[PDB]
Symmetry: D3
Subunit: 266 residues, 6 copies
């Protein structure tokens, strides 16, 4: 894997946005061949969405032929709720870019038949062929998407029960009221993510240091599902400074040597 | 994976038997489309076989269209020996249910050409397509079937040399005479097991606590082959109380929350 | 996996050479169906190449229908440099055996288009179908080929940046001048190696003890890429005495019991 | 050690306060033979101080002949400043009980000679003889007061440098401004603490779960200073529920069984 | 420490007995200056007691001036009861040697004041001065007598609660009925043991392999009490073959080389 | 502990030498009150001895009233022999400073009674009182002098057996012939070292990286004797850059911040 050792969240967002833009422009998407982009929500991707929107306004990128798939969504939460991932995505991205409504794909957390909703989501991805770039984040306990500890490393899209710690962490968005945080979520699986051509994970803060250590220096295991990246042929972790504190000196030294030239330029 | 935290061996057997029955009845097997069931031997599955037989006698299940494959068998041990897995299976299951003789598949530990015997076993499974549910147990040192420590995680059916500790453990069935325990066995491989649609492992006793910890909280590795379950899309571990002592409190708490409703009802 | 516990480097070379010879002669290669052999360089395979050459001179083996692929090569290093892997291979093997020039495949570390060179190398392997036996070694830090720490376990042939420690270790061949050691190399990937039918790794010296421990008793992880062997269906590690010092007593005992008969005979 | 597995911080405070009172009254302190109590600050001991104060108000305990020693203080900071441990101790405890000023001992951060003051503090403790009970908390990283990771396990009272993470954890009381949190502070040493007759550590919150695991199931090491308790003949850890989530099931089970009768009524 | 790598329990007993005799005769005890010997119970020391008794019968050693202290006893249990450590010690040792009753020290589980008795036991040891040699065993979980996991490494003689696993391990001598195995017992402490001039631990069986690994290669920690030996200036572990299986090859190799001449003739 | 993160061995030697001089001159030794200095041999302390000698030549320090004790020596080897620690100490230090012969203490490997000599060495140290500063190095496996893995953490001066790896590591000075490297040697103990008022360990080279990690981030254990420093109230590790590569980023970051002003000018 590649690990981009940056300093601030601002830099991480600019780097991630530029990488997405560069992939899209080199791909040259069309109506017959769209660029498929996987997306996450949360506080981590905020600076990236900001940079992407700016780049679009400047005419540096167009999403007219970009199809998106989000990694997850809360179950039972009204779609119109400000904290639903649907709301998050339109507010921070879709509302501001030229992406067609038919090109947007989100999991329906209120679908009557849960397994059916998830199965059709996988079918939708299959209709296109593959996700060219899936961007995501990592949980304090190492989850990728909502693939909580003890989730199959070959899992597909399905419903999952969030850990109490994940609910506490996410309660920051529900007025610090853990009881308002949904208990279940629909999430793409580890296998679903591994099927993507390229995976780019954003990592910010000291709160993510242990998870970054697990992803980079730890072993492949289903407790810290982010470790699945070790099995992916093209994974990139874009990190800020605080997030790298638990890595070994030689490890960070190596990544700094590799990316010295690829980090200076914004 | 799913982990069913039960209390006694009796409960484990009733839960496992019910799961098998439910899978079969929902599948609706026929002569053109049989339900393929993988089976284990040993002291662990005893209460499960007992429950299955009871359920059959009550007309709750029929094996007329169920095809079985056992995971292993001792090499060189006369088929008529009471401790051969062939004898174990007929005595505790086949003799008591309506399963056709042509539907039963067992490895011949006395075959003249070992590799040939194993190859044909894999071919037999392939003739059906796939094993819909493979039930098994776990060794004190973490083996699944007889895939002893340092067995390929992509192994196929083959002959294996048992560890001295495995022979000592199994000597309980040979009048506590380790020298009477066969040194070799034919066993389906880790890859063979991973090809099954669903894997259900029964775990009983304090003697299995370290192996359960390895399977659940440990890393993927070939020393404790049971760790392969982390790579399987549909694995279930059915455990008694003593077997969960080495897990973290938060881990058992999570599984208890998930299965609270699925455990009460027998 | 199989682990052959031998005593000296001489024995390791004789055992590895015999295994290669036996595989080739049983295969019976022809112009329509050649035997594809993957090869390494370095100080480790020296006694093996010596034994192979001797066996060829004695008429025990012919390479007329053997196609070879080397695992790596230094980038930017003149092909004519005595320490290039190209030079190493001709000097220690090709110059002494009846293998056709068209049957030899080596990565061109001075190719103008790096990704293109690597892609065509993979295509060349694909043209044959598969590598029947890939022989290699292991780095002090556990690398297989030049798949340095944090290399994808599903990687393909590509350019890699060597770790400072790898350069120091290899400096022994550049007059102990680390600054003369190339910084980059083209190397087959972990996935490339996993696609081989059989992988045989030679392990010599106390300097490799920690790497052997990682490969055998450690977990699957991308830091010690040699751990990928746990995912391979047919891997063999041929070791000398010093290299086994970090293994557990029971582990070495098991391998000694398994190979007792397969080690005496040269 | 003893570990008291309680549910809430309210229960922890009541248990800890009762223990202090029990020890004080059994000792029956006098002017010539005072009971010496070591004390901590921060949010952790809040429920204990409140409970202890109410016990005093009800006439169950008197501090007329109780001498106290606090574990730390800021250097060069005006004692009057609210963000001083002096201010904390008076506001939350001393202001509300009958302890004489001459019986209160706090490190003077404004001492003319630091190394002289710290020496004097140790001298003062020996002047009485020993601290009969030292109450404390534990940091997220396992620290005790200012004995940060890598502090000698035989350290005495001295000046110390705070970790960046510790400053961030305490910035909460500094208007979330880390720039206001002191970088140094006078603190009793690990050896100083170990010399106490009994040590009682309060553990509250999920943020302390890893530290508790290190203290209870980890090895003795100076990175997690709390591990020092394993070397003490009379240590007690009073915990709430979330702080115990990282412990093994059998560990928590053991302490629950042992203290079942000692936590009734809370 | 010294580790004596022997093969059978018979050899272990002969080596340990000879060591005790060697120490006793070199000391040359008298009425005013007795040799103080600490002793254990259970199945582990059986071959040692038998060998020691035969050495006495042959006139190679006398216990006329040897004072003994046993590590533990049950509380509130009639001394007369066969399942008492008093009964064990007499039946397997005292009944057969010339030690005077006044020289025998066993904790009185029927003491009117437990905390008073334990204190008296420590007092008795100091009355002589010190224990010159303390022989013991090790539990499957690393315990020593009743110093179960999480016992202070500086503990003194006191009352203690047995783990459920310990009770199960000893239920063998209680008709396999755990309900008959006492839940408590008076036991010397880890500190008590460390105060002995020399400590010799007997290690027998595969069931002790993990404990031996913890004692020899693990870190100092109170979960595996046997790790305390690393803090003692004169400790010796006398082991049989199966108990050494979890150690590293280099570890066992080291002790074999060191004691090669010291184990000849057994 | 304090860890001084320097870059080169030249800087390490200058820092360590200056520290020794600072301590000596602050102490102001006299005939009746000498400064006692513990010393090591090998390649590690070379830059320190050279720097110390130049400081003496410049008149910044005198050894007229400095008494020295070296950590070890070979047994039965002629003191005259060049490959003796006596010869090393004089050639690299004593020959160049004004220390009187009567102030030099080295273990006599040719003592008529070894156990008597070692006892005498400890006696000599106590005759002065204590060693004020003991300088040492660390072995690749964490050893200190001859306190090889599995040496008691409370060991005194005694005779010891070297590990095979230690002999190989030192064979460099023995014409690369391990057969010339002694198998035994008289050495001060871990307890002996811990009794010193201050301990300063020099750490140089990538070969010491794992040992440094064990000393700083590992747990107290007798396999890595250097871990004993965690139990000492005044330990200092002076390191070069490559020796710190296995430490965590946050660990090195902490020491760099702490010693930033203390390493300026080197
Ligand atoms: C309601 C709910 O939470 N259901 C999930 C199920 O969807 C998931 O498949 C399984 C764990 O398995 P996995 O993570 O390995 O798929 O756990 C639970 O049964
Ligand atoms: C007689 C016998 O025991 N043969 C087995 C072989 O069948 C197995 O393939 C290999 C280990 O490899 P695996 O577990 O990775 O297949 O070990 C031994 O050679
Ligand atoms: C010039 C160079 O060193 N390029 C390599 C690239 O080829 C490799 O793919 C990646 C790590 O990823 P991998 O080991 O997972 O492929 O690192 C670097 O970008
Ligand atoms: C100004 C300052 O911060 N001084 C401290 C010193 O007092 C302490 O002794 C040492 C760490 O060692 P310790 O924690 O092992 O004492 O670090 C620093 O030198
Ligand atoms: C009745 C009983 O079981 N009392 C013991 C006590 O004697 C012991 O001191 C403590 C554990 O601490 P220790 O093992 O560290 O002494 O546990 C229990 O309180
Ligand atoms: C001749 C010889 O090598 N004797 C040493 C002995 O002096 C040492 O005490 C012990 C290990 O124990 P220690 O390192 O814990 O003292 O090993 C050997 O018996």
């Amino acid at each position: 894997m590649r690990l981009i050792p940056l300093t601030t969240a601002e830099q991480v967002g600019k780097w991630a946005a530029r990488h997405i833009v560069n992939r899209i422009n080199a791909f040259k998407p069309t109506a017959d061949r769209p660029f498929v982009l996987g997306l996450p929500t949360g506080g981590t991707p905020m600076t990236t969405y900001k940079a992407l929107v700016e780049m679009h306004k400047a005419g540096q990128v167009s999403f007219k032929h970009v199809v998106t798939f989000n990694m997850d969504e809360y179950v039972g939460l009204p779609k119109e709720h400000p904290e639903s991932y649907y709301s998050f995505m339109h507010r921070n991205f879709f509302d501001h870019v030229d992406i067609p409504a038919e090109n947007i794909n989100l999991l329906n957390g209120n679908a009557p038949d849960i397994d059916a909703e998830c199965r059709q989501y996988e079918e939708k991805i299959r209709s296109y062929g593959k996700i060219h770039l899936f961007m995501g984040g990592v949980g304090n306990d190492g989850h990728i998407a909502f693939n909580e500890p003890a989730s199959s490393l070959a899992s597909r899209t399905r419903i999952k029960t969030l850990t109490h710690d994940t609910r506490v962490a996410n309660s920051r968005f529900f007025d610090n009221d853990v009881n308002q945080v949904p208990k279940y979520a629909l999430t793409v699986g580890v296998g679903t993510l591994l099927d993507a051509e390229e995976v780019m994970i954003l990592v910010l803060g000291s709160q993510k240091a242990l998870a970054l250590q697990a992803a980079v220096e730890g072993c492949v295991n289903h407790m810290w599902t982010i470790s699945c990246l070790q099995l992916h042929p093209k994974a990139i972790m874009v990190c800020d400074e605080p997030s790298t504190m638990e890595l070994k000196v030689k490890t960070l030294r190596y990544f700094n040597e590799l990316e010295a030239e690829n980090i200076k330029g914004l």
